[PDB]
């Protein structure tokens, strides 16, 4: 049904994302248990880490386009990522390695992420209809990888420990690298223009030097968030000031403010929503005992189901507004499950958490898929810069928001934590409901401006 290179790209993507989510799903619990952070520290640090993971993507896109090539940067990024995962394994012996390891992962991701998408959209002539299908299939592969990692990574960590987990993440990166290399043949005429000239060692050296400077800067930032806050505040206010000095770009700015809200919301799945599942939800479903951390796998799961369906089934400000409403509903459902359908002992049905994740995934299916690709139809380099900037700012802010649900180590009564989760979740759901209402109000104006 699809070209031969499609399936290569599909599986390299699956394994890379398997490693990444194998880390994300266990990271905050790792900060709390293994490094003895308090939940407030773990949440803000996870914030900084995601912020860099998503802020650095722009760079990898540019390095693949104009310095090194696309297939080269896929190899380079996979190698730096495997090194990061193995470093994180080695952090258990050497704890002071942890931040450096995370920085490596961030930089590794920043170099790698944008390229396979580029590679994929060159396996097809410019108007081949199959494109859309492949893209959704591409998304599904990401989510299959995510689905598997979040399912098994915590189980593995509990029965064998964080070193074995992280090394499995590495091993998955190595598997992706071997697939790509053993299929170099299939991509012999595919790539960007630097993939067919010989490799400039000058540029390669600059990319290595800068990668390493960026690794040490990531590590400095995740250990000292207080200054990461200021770095991104100044960078953001200044890039909006040079956006406000310099009609479709204004609709892009409104769409980015809403995407920022949606990313603040997405940031909760690995932190506060995770700890809500740990603390106030039954750890059994259909009679099976499950590790509560595995509940995060519910996000990719619904995506994997609903994206075919929803790909089989207005336009831009409308779909954005729809997604906003969906996320609003996810948090109102969480708060309501806490406030009214709890046991005498403060525990709640995991079916309520399944519904939360369904609402969240639908919101993702609208906002995340559309906004990035269609901010590009509204448009440019400066706005990807600012788009990744503000998404990173969103993750920082999400971590700060998570801290409102943080629980001291000595609390052991679900009935004492339950009111805290429901107060924060209700307030979140209500604020984003107001936001989606204003969005709806502004929808027709924006549609006229887009035309």
């Amino acid at each position, epitope marked *: 049904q699809q070209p031969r290179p499609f399936f290569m790209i599909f599986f390299v993507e699956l394994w890379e994302r398997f490693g990444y989510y194998g880390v994300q799903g266990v990271l905050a619990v790792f900060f709390v248990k293994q490094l003895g952070f308090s939940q407030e520290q773990a949440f803000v640090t996870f914030g900084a880490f995601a912020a860099l993971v998503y802020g650095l993507i722009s760079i990898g896109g540019y390095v693949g386009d104009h310095l090194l090539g696309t297939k080269r940067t896929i190899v380079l990024g996979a190698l730096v990522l495997a090194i990061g995962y193995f470093m994180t394994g080695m952090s258990l012996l050497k704890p002071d390695l942890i931040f450096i390891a995370l920085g490596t992962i961030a930089v590794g991701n920043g170099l790698f992420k944008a390229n396979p998408a580029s590679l994929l959209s060159k396996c097809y002539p410019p108007k081949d209809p199959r494109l859309d299908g492949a893209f959704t299939l591409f998304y599904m592969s990401i989510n299959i990888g995510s689905l598997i990692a979040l399912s098994l990574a915590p189980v593995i960590a509990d*029965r064998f420990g964080y070193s074995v987990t992280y090394n499995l993440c590495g091993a998955g990166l190595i598997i992706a690298l071997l697939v790509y290399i053993a299929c170099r043949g299939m991509v012999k005429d595919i790539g960007s223009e630097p993939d067919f000239r010989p490799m400039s060692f000058s540029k390669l050296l600059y990319v290595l030097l800068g990668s390493v400077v960026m690794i040490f800067v990531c590590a400095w930032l995740m250990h000292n968030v207080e200054v990461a806050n200021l770095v991104l505040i100044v960078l953001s206010i200044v890039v909006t000031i040079i956006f406000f000095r310099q009609n479709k770009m204004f609709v892009a700015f409104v769409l980015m403010l809403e995407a920022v809200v949606f990313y603040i919301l997405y940031a909760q799945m690995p932190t506060s929503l995770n700890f809500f599942a740990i603390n106030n939800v039954h750890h059994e479903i259909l009679g099976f005992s499950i590790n509560p951390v595995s509940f995060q796998a519910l996000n990719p799961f619904w995506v994997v189901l609903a994206s075919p369906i929803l790909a089989g089934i207005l336009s831009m400000p409308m779909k954005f507004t729809l997604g906003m409403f969906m996320c609003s509903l996810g948090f109102l459902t969480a708060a309501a499950a806490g406030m009214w359908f709890a046991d005498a002992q403060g525990l709640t049905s995991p079916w309520f958490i399944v519904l939360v994740y369904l609402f969240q995934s639908l919101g993702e299916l609208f906002i995340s898929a559309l906004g990035l690709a269609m901010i590009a139809a509204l448009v440019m380099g400066f706005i990807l810069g600012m788009w990744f900037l503000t998404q990173a700012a969103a993750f920082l802010l999400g971590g700060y928001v998570a801290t409102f649900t943080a629980v001291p180590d000595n609390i052991t009564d679900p009935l004492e934590t339950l009111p805290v989760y429901t107060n924060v979740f209700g307030k979140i759901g209500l604020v984003t409901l107001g936001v989606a209402v204003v969005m709806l109000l502004m929808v027709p104006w924006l549609k006229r401006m887009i035309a």
Partner: nanobody
Amino acid sequence: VQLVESGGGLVQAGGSLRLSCAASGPTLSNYAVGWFRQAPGKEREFVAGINWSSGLRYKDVVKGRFTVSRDNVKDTVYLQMNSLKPEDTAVYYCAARFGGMLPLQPSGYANWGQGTQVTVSS
């Protein structure tokens, strides 16, 4: 998933037993461990427990007398029972729930030891 209880016995009032809960596959470090007891003719009731980061919880009637503690090296959880009274006579179960919470009812706990008889005589 599977806990091994040990330490039960017959003791005279004012005497002292120590129960112990260890686990097989998983590490008990990621678990709150509660000790429940079922007296003849009654339902399982929460005695005392310790969460995954050393938070403690106790039933009123055992405060002062029962101490919960955790050896993370040996991967074991201990319950010291001093000043025992005849109403402490029961089957004692340990239960493990992942994380930092210690709910009061047996339904908040998915992994369960086999039970151990404790008898305290007058």
